[PDB]
Design an enzyme around this catalytic site. Structure first.
Site, PDB file in Angstrom:
ATOM      1  CD  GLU A 130      -5.289   5.512   0.414  1.00 37.48           C
ATOM      2  OE1 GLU A 130      -4.761   5.048   1.457  1.00 37.48           O
ATOM      3  OE2 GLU A 130      -6.331   5.058  -0.104  1.00 37.48           O
ATOM      4  CD  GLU A 131      -3.646   8.529  -6.952  1.00 32.56           C
ATOM      5  OE1 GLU A 131      -3.645   9.779  -6.917  1.00 32.56           O
ATOM      6  OE2 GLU A 131      -4.499   7.865  -7.581  1.00 32.56           O
ATOM      7  CD1 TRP A 141      -2.399   2.055   1.672  1.00 32.69           C
ATOM      8  CD2 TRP A 141      -3.251   0.641   0.152  1.00 32.69           C
ATOM      9  NE1 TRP A 141      -3.599   2.562   1.253  1.00 32.69           N
ATOM     10  CE2 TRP A 141      -4.140   1.724   0.311  1.00 32.69           C
ATOM     11  CE3 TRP A 141      -3.577  -0.372  -0.764  1.00 32.69           C
ATOM     12  CZ2 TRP A 141      -5.342   1.825  -0.410  1.00 32.69           C
ATOM     13  CZ3 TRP A 141      -4.771  -0.270  -1.483  1.00 32.69           C
ATOM     14  CH2 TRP A 141      -5.641   0.821  -1.296  1.00 32.69           C
ATOM     15  CD  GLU A 162     -13.759   7.189  -4.806  1.00 29.47           C
ATOM     16  OE1 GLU A 162     -13.703   6.756  -5.975  1.00 29.47           O
ATOM     17  OE2 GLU A 162     -12.982   6.838  -3.901  1.00 29.47           O
ATOM     18  CG  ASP A 164      -1.247  11.951  -2.376  1.00 29.66           C
ATOM     19  OD1 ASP A 164      -0.808  10.807  -2.583  1.00 29.66           O
ATOM     20  OD2 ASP A 164      -2.171  12.443  -3.063  1.00 29.66           O
TER      21      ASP A 164
END
Ligand SMILES: *[C@@H]1O[C@H](CO)[C@@H](O[C@@H]2O[C@H](CO)[C@@H](O)[C@H](O)[C@H]2NC(C)=O)[C@H](O)[C@H]1NC(C)=O
Ligand code: MAN
Ligand code: MAN
Ligand code: MAN
Ligand code: MAN
Ligand code: CA
Length: 599
Positions: free
Chosen positions: A179-180, A120, A404, A176
């Site tokens: 999650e990237e 992750w 979302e 960030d």
């Protein structure tokens, strides 16, 4: 009308938000108590996890609501969310352990309150900051209602771990909020600063040393100034890396609204919503979406548009997000609040372009509440802000569900269903339009920028918290606005429940996972009539399989997962049989049964 939308959506948003909170929420039934699922979506996408960020942002909204009006149901949920943190903080996870603090930067966990073991984007150093802000938020309530003893006993050791984490690790790169991007992130730094300020204040209220937090805070704020791109008038949301983007990202708009404090006025150092830098940034960020989405076609400059995370986004092809579009509305409502309260709007060279889009040809200057310029500006900004609400409202289904994303061309919902953060983003944005603001976190001390940034950090002490329970009946002091506990909206009691089996098992080539069980729908222990699960999700150190069977509500079920090879061969998981009671509760139509393979 916008008012109609708010009227109808408000109770649906609150309900749906709370359906995502364990252990009893209607779409989070059987999850750990206090847990917040990001979404009930278990496949395409799989959001059935607890994020430190999402849960802390959702509970900050709920804590703020609880503060405005005492609600014993909310309190129960808040207390549960807080005690679950005792468990999570103690967990060794792939980010590390509690002992050196590193484990606290872990982004997400299983909803069993266990380590997520897959690869992750870790660590994410915003989590401890947001969690601290949430728990400090409830602490201030407890202190102000004569429960400071409970803060010191139960809450403080949690907050202290998170504050130490921020003070120790703020000046290191991480992923960030999307999650990237591995680097230094605006949202992350700004909330880290906020947390330290608030944490130094809480320390002093408890009679503890806030010296570590106060010495570091202004250095975090100092570094936050480096994200500003002066030549373009916007925030580069991620620095200390070249992420292959402009850095125009709703990241920075989300930052502005989440560190809002009207007692700081239009302060640019902390990037207040009405600050010239925040406004300039907002326009640039909005502009990045104006020409690129099908849904924004034919909408003119000065009118609200659907906005996404960042223009370079390819996730689900890169679409508007409800929370992004709501964030733009919210920043403007926050600015309107301050302008109305102070009776004055200042336009500067930096904010010139933002204001000129809405009032063409307006010059820099200061305009008092009685001037016509002030009226032109505030009217145009109010219409614009409602326009962002109305834009997102265009693409909300009749039932008021908030996914979302909504499609860049058609505006139909995409990605995770019932995203908890979407609901919170609706609730906060509309709260601000109503002129309801959060508790203040700062005075002008928290906005003073040092002449130099030192990058100062402090190695902290970490101890496992021990107190995992709140005293019963911690009711408010007299006078404080109060009300009956929250009750979810009514539904029918299901005769049937969709039961998503959610299994962790490492499989070889071509192998399928099936669930064999006692009920007819599970094939009465017949391996050939067993229910097949989806290999979709199987990942490095996270080998996940899901299958959804309709089982009768109230039925007690015995099952085993079977590993069925390509050759139709069966291996059985070790004893014992699983035993699960399918719920029979109003509104509970789909549940997830999370399991690990028994060797
Ligand atoms: C740790 O803190 C320091 C000080 O804020 C940061 O160093 C600055 O980085 C910016 C952006 O790269 C430079 O333009 C400055 O010249 C640096 N300032 C000084 C005084 O060295 C550093 O980027 C921070 N690192 C992390 C990962 O947060
Ligand atoms: C919270 O949970 C702990 C278990 O770790 C108990 O010891 C405590 O009494 C509280 O219920
Ligand atoms: C699940 O557990 C129950 C106990 O409630 C047993 O009866 C069953 O055999 C299975 O192991
Ligand atoms: C679910 O709960 C039922 C009764 O509450 C039990 O019979 C079963 O063993 C399972 O724990
Ligand atoms: C079961 O059905 C109910 C009602 O349609 C939903 O609220 C729930 O999300 C699940 O799909
Ligand atoms: Ca950048």
């Amino acid at each position: 009308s916008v008012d109609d939308f708010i009227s109808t959506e408000t109770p649906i948003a609150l309900n749906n938000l709370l359906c995502n909170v364990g252990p009893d929420g209607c779409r989070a039934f059987g999850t750990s108590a206090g847990a917040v699922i990001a979404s009930p979506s278990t496949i395409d996408p799989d959001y059935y996890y607890m994020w430190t960020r999402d849960s802390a942002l959702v509970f900050k909204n709920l804590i703020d609501r609880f503060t405005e009006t005492y609600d014993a149901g909310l309190q129960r949920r808040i207390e549960q969310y807080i005690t679950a943190q005792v468990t999570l903080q103690g967990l060794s996870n792939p980010s590390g352990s509690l002992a050196d603090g590193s484990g606290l930067g872990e982004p997400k966990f299983e909803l069993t309150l266990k380590p997520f073991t897959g690869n992750w984007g870790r660590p994410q150093r915003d989590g401890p900051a947001l969690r601290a802000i949430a728990l400090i938020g409830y602490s201030k309530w407890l202190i102000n209602n004569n429960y400071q003893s409970t803060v010191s006993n139960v809450i403080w050791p949690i907050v202290r771990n998170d504050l130490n984490y921020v003070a120790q690790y703020w000046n290191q790169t991480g992923f960030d909020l999307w999650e990237e991007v591995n680097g230094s992130s605006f949202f992350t730094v700004a909330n880290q600063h906020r947390a330290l300020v608030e944490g130094a204040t809480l320390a002093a209220t408890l009679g503890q040393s806030g010296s570590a937090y106060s010495s570091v805070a202004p250095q975090v704020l100092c570094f936050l100034q480096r994200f500003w791109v002066s030549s373009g008038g916007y925030v580069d949301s991620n620095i200390n890396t070249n992420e292959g983007r402009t850095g125009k990202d709703v990241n920075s708009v989300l930052t502005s609204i989440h560190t809002f404090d009207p007692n700081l006025g239009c302060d640019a150092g902390t990037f207040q919503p009405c600050s010239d830098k925040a406004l300039s940034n907002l326009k640039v960020v909005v502009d990045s979406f104006r020409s690129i989405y099908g849904v924004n076609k034919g909408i003119p400059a000065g009118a609200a548009v659907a906005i996404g995370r960042y223009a370079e986004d390819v996730y689900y092809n890169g679409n508007p997000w409800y929370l992004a579009t709501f964030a733009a509305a919210e920043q403007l409502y926050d600015a309107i609040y301050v302008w109305k309260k102070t009776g004055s709007i200042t336009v500067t060279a930096t904010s010139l372009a933002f204001f000129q889009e809405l009032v063409p040809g307006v010059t820099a200057g200061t305009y008092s509440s009685s001037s016509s310029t002030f009226t032109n500006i505030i009217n145009a900004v109010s219409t614009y802000a409602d326009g962002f609400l109305s834009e997102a409202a265009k693409y909300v289904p009749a039932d008021g569900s908030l996914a979302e994303q909504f499609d860049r061309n058609s505006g139909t919902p995409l990605s995770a269903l019932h995203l908890t953060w979407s609901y919170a983003s609706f609730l906060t944005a509309t709260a601000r339009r109503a002129g309801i603001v959060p508790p203040s976190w700062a005075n002008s001390s928290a906005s003073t920028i040092p002449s130099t940034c030192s990058g100062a950090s402090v190695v902290g002490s970490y101890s496992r918290p021990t107190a995992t329970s709140f005293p019963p009946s911690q009711t408010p002091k007299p006078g404080v606005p109060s009300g009956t506990p929250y009750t979810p909206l009514p539904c029918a009691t299901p005769t049937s429940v969709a039961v998503t089996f959610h299994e962790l098992v490492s499989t070889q080539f071509g192998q399928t996972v099936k669930v064999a069980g006692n009920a007819a729908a599970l094939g009465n222990w017949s391996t050939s009539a067993a229910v097949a699960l989806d290999a979709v999700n199987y990942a490095d150190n996270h080998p996940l399989w899901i299958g959804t069977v309709n089982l009768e509500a109230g039925d007690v079920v015995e099952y085993k997962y079977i590993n069925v090879g390509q050759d139709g061969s069966v291996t059985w998981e070790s004893d014992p049989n699983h035993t699960y009671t399918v719920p029979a509760v109003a509104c509970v139509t789909q549940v997830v049964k999370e399991d690990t393979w028994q060797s």
